[PDB]
Amino acid sequence: TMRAVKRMINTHLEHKRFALINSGNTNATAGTVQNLSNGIIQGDDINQRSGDQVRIVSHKLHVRGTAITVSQTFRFIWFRDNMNRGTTPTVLEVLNTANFMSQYNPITLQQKRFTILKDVTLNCSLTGESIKDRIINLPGQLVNYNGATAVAASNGPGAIFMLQIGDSLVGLWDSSYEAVYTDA
């Protein structure tokens, strides 16, 4: 009945909820890393937290790419930083080289610095489907924080991020994110 104890435990805990949107970004050939969980700050509201831990019950990521000028590729890597000490990770920490085709960095994946949640490649064609999107929903895990406010120094172990990278600087991408979490 351990599955029953877990359930009733959860019925006593508020499932707080945080939403984020990030629209109108340029595709990046060298890549960028975007914060997802950083925006849950200390405070008393439904989308805030008490202390330096929350536990994500589920979270959802929506990504979108639109080709501009040339047909092009957008890659989105949704990941957990298991070992974050107050930074936004770099592209080269996640990828072997800063290229949209690159495989993961062998060292950081060997030691499990990161866990990859989803790796999505969208090809947007100006002679075909020039707009593409993907939404992904996943159960979550503990998130630890190193500080109270929405700055990079507050990220901690379990922080959630998304790396974007592609083969042009000209196309535009949008994202949004929701986390449902307890905070007991």
Q: Which residues of 112-139 are buried (b: 16+ CB within 10 A; e: fewer)?
A: ebbeebeebbbbbeeeeeeebeeeeeee
Least Cβ distance, residue 147 to a copy of itself (angstroms): 8
Looking only at residues 109 through 148 of this chain, which bind Ca ion when binding is defined by CB under 5 A? 127-128
Q: Residue 172 has which token pair?
A: 């535009």
Cα–Cα–Cα angle for 136, 55, 52, rounded to 5 degrees: 125
Whether residue 26 is annotated as binding a ligand: the answer is no
Among 121, 136, 151, 153, contact with a copy of itself (rule: CB under 8 A): 121
Whether residue 72 is annotated as binding a ligand: the answer is no
Tell me whether residue 90 or residue 182 sits nearer to Ca ion (CB atom): 182
Whether residue 53 is annotated as binding a ligand: the answer is yes
| Cβ count near 156 (within 10 Å) | 21
User: Is 183 an interacting residue with respect to Ca ion (CB under 5 A)?
Assistant: yes
Amino acid type, 86: G
Whether residue 127 is annotated as binding a ligand: the answer is yes
Among 25, 92, 144, 151, contact with a copy of itself (rule: CB under 8 A): 144
Looking only at residues 122 through 141 of this chain, which bind a copy of itself when binding is defined by CB under 8 A? 123, 125-133, 135
Among 14, 23, 46, 103, contact with Ca ion (rule: CB under 5 A): 14
Q: Quick check: 65 and 149 in contact, CB under 8 A?
A: no
Residue 47 CA to residue 146 CA, distance in Å, equals: 18
Cα four-point dihedral sign 166, 22, 89, 179: negative
Whether residue 44 is annotated as binding a ligand: the answer is yes
Looking only at residues 88 through 117 of this chain, which bind a copy of itself when binding is defined by CB under 8 A? 96-97, 99, 101-107, 109-113
Whether residue 50 is annotated as binding a ligand: the answer is yes
Give the total residue count for the chain. Answer: 184
Q: Residue 66 has which token pair?
A: 């639109």
Least Cβ distance, residue 44 to a copy of itself (angstroms): 4
Least Cβ distance, residue 81 to a copy of itself (angstroms): 10
Residue 95 CA to residue 6 CA, distance in Å, equals: 37
User: Is 58 an interacting residue with respect to a copy of itself (CB under 8 A)?
Assistant: no
Count of residues interacting with Ca ion (CB under 5 A): 8
Could you list the residues known to form a binding site for Ca(2+), using ranges.
14, 44, 50, 53, 127, 183
